[PDB]
RNA sequence: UGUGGAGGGAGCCGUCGAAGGUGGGAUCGGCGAUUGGGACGAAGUCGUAACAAGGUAGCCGUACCGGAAGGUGCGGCUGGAUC
């Protein structure tokens, strides 16, 4: 087993986590 | 025998009636000032996060935080090394 491939998947992971808690307001607060 | 009679048609009325209009909706596309992140880039800036115990072992899930890689906490795994 390796990890590059895990870590791939952790960084998209991580930064689509970041873009969320940076439109956690606009997101709720357009879509309704 | 007579402008007689059935009977029929014209004509008219009603049912159904396409197209035309009104109506608020569905669905499908396009545009959209601005705003995202995505790929590639020549060559550059910021750092050293990772690979050997990568110099604080990494990694999974989660929460918080941070200029950025990332850091810390709780639990877990070895795909973790020496003795």
Same mark, same amino acid.
């Given at each position: 087993?390796?990890?590059?491939?895990? $870590?791939? #998947? $952790?960084?998209? %992971? #991580?930064?689509? =986590?970041?873009? +969320? $808690? =940076?439109? $956690?307001?606009? =997101? =709720? %607060? +357009?879509? #309704?």
């Amino acid at each position: 087993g390796s990890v590059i491939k895990k $870590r791939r #998947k $952790r960084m998209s %992971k #991580k930064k689509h =986590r970041k873009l +969320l $808690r =940076r439109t $956690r307001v606009q =997101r =709720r %607060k +357009l879509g #309704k």
